[PDB]
Amino acid sequence: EEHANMQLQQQAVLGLNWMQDSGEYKALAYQAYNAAKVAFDHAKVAKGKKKAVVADLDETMLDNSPYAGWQVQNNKPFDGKDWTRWVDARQSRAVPGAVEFNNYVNSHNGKVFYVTNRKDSTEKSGTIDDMKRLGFNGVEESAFYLKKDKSAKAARFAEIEKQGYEIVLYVGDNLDDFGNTVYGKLNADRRAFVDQNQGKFGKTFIMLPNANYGGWEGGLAEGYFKKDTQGQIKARLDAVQAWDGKL
Amino acid sequence: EEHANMQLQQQAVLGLNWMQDSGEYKALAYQAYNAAKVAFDHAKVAKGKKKAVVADLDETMLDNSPYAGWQVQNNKPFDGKDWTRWVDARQSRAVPGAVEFNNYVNSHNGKVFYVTNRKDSTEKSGTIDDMKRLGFNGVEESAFYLKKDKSAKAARFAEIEKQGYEIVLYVGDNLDDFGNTVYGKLNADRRAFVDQNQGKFGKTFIMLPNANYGGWEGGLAEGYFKKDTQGQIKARLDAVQAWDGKL
Ligand SMILES: Nc1ncnc2c1ncn2[C@@H]1O[C@H](COP(O)(O)=S)[C@@H](O)[C@H]1O
Ligand SMILES: Nc1ncnc2c1ncn2[C@@H]1O[C@H](COP(O)(O)=S)[C@@H](O)[C@H]1O
Ligand SMILES: [Mg+2]
Ligand SMILES: [Mg+2]
C-alpha cells in the first residue's frame, strides 16, 4: 500500500530535518570528535602493540542523509538494492569533525580501521572514491573491513587485533559498533548494555547521533524487520510512551 | 484541519522512538555528562570568583518525552497551555547522567544554576517538586532562573555573573542555551555559530540530543512559528535535502 509507505516514511521527517539542518547536530558531531581526540591522545597500549582506532562509516564518518531524503520524497522503505545505487552515486558527505580526527589519528602513531556494513563486493568502489574526495587520509583498501557474510562486527574487530593492533577506542552511531553483546536484541537489553558501560561513553566508546535508522529501530519489537509496513508503523506507535493528559 | 495536525505530529514519531527507547540516546546523554565532569574538574576561575555551571532543564536535565508522546497520540501541535498542564502533572523524568553530574558539581566547590524557559509564575512549583523527587540536590528556589519576560537566556547568564560567579561551562540541547548570538536566527546562521565554536563542544559547551523540538525547528524557515499547520508541514518538507535517485 502506497498509503502505508508514505506514513512510515513521513515519521522520519522531523528527525531528518534535525540531522540535516540543525546546528545542534553539528555540535554533537564536534563534541564526539573532540572527545575522541582526547581519548586517543591519552591512550596507552600494551608493549609491542600498534595503536588502532575502529570507526564505523555510515552516520559516523559518512553522512548518507540525502538517501533518507529520497526515501521521504518517494515513500520508499529501506531496500538494500536502492542503497547500493546510492553508494554507487558517489554523493556521500562527511560527518563534521570526522576527517580531521581520522587524519590526526593516522598522522600521530595510530591507524583508523573502517569496520562498516557497506558491502565489500558491491559497495567498496563508491565508498573509497567518496572518502578520497572528502579528504580522508589512509583509505587504501586494507584499511577497510567491509561486510562480507555477517553484519555483526566483533569478528572484524578480532581480525584487527590479530594483525598486532590494540584498539584504543571505537566510534559509532549504533551500539553494535562497540561489539556483539546486544546485536539483534530488543531495546531493553540495549539500554541495559549502555547502563552497564556508562563510564565508557565519550572515552573508549564514542557516540554519534542517528535518529533515522539503526539497531534501535529493529529493537522496537520482536521480529520488527520481518514485519510488513503496517506492522512496522504499529510497532513504532506502540512503542510511544505518552502522558495521559491528567494530573 | 485534523488531517494536517496528524501529519505534522506523525513526522515526530521516529525521532521520538529514538529518544524514548534507544540505548544510543542514553549513551549520548552519558557521553555528554562524562565530558561535562571532566570539563568541570579542569576548570579554573578568576581570583575571587565562585565556580558556576549553567544548565538548561528541558531535554537537558529533565526528560519531557511523555508530553511529545501525548502530542503524537492526540494530534496536538505544541501549545503553551498544554505545556503548563504537563509541568503541573509532575511526571517529568531525569535525563541519564544529569542528577549525578548536578550533585557532583554541587558537592565539589561548584553551583549549578538552572536557566530554563519553564515559566517562573506558573511552572515553578511542578519543576521544583519533580527535581526534588528525581534526586537533584541544590534545588532551592534561588538556584533557578525561570522565564519571566524573555526566552533569550543571555541576560540571566549575566545575572549569575553579577552575583560573583564565573560560569565554567554550559549544558544544553539548544544552541540558545549557550548565548543569544543566534537566537531567533535561521539554521544557516546557527550552523555557522557552531563552526565558529567547533573546539568548545564537549568542553565548555556541553550538548544533549533533541530531535523533537527547539530553535532548530523555527530555524527551518523565516517566520516558521507564526505559520499555520500546513505551512509548517511545507517548511519541513521543503527543508529536506534529497538524492535525486541518479548516479
Ligand atoms: N534506513 C535504513 N534502515 C536499515 N538499514 C539501513 C538504512 N540506511 C542504510 N542502511 C544499511 O545499514 C548499513 C549501516 O552500516 P553500519 O556499518 O553504519 S551498521 C548501511 O551500509 C546500509 O546497508
Ligand atoms: N514541542 C515544542 N515546541 C516548541 N516549544 C516547546 C516544545 N516542548 C516544550 N516547549 C517549550 O520550550 C521550553 C523549552 O525550554 P528550554 O529552557 O529547554 S529553551 C519549554 O519549557 C516549553 O515552554
Ligand atoms: Mg553506522
Ligand atoms: Mg532545553
UniProtKB/Swiss-Prot annotation, chains A, B:
Membrane topology reported for the UniProt record: Lipid-anchor
A Pfam family annotated for this UniProt entry: Acid_phosphat_B
Tagged with keyword Iron-sulfur: no
Cellular localisation: Cell outer membrane
Keywords assigned: Cell outer membrane, Lipoprotein, Membrane, Palmitate, Signal
NCBIfam families noted in UniProt: lipo_e_P4 (TIGR01533)
PANTHER family given in the database record: ACID PHOSPHATASE-LIKE PROTEIN (PTHR31284:SF10)
The name this protein goes by in its record: Lipoprotein E
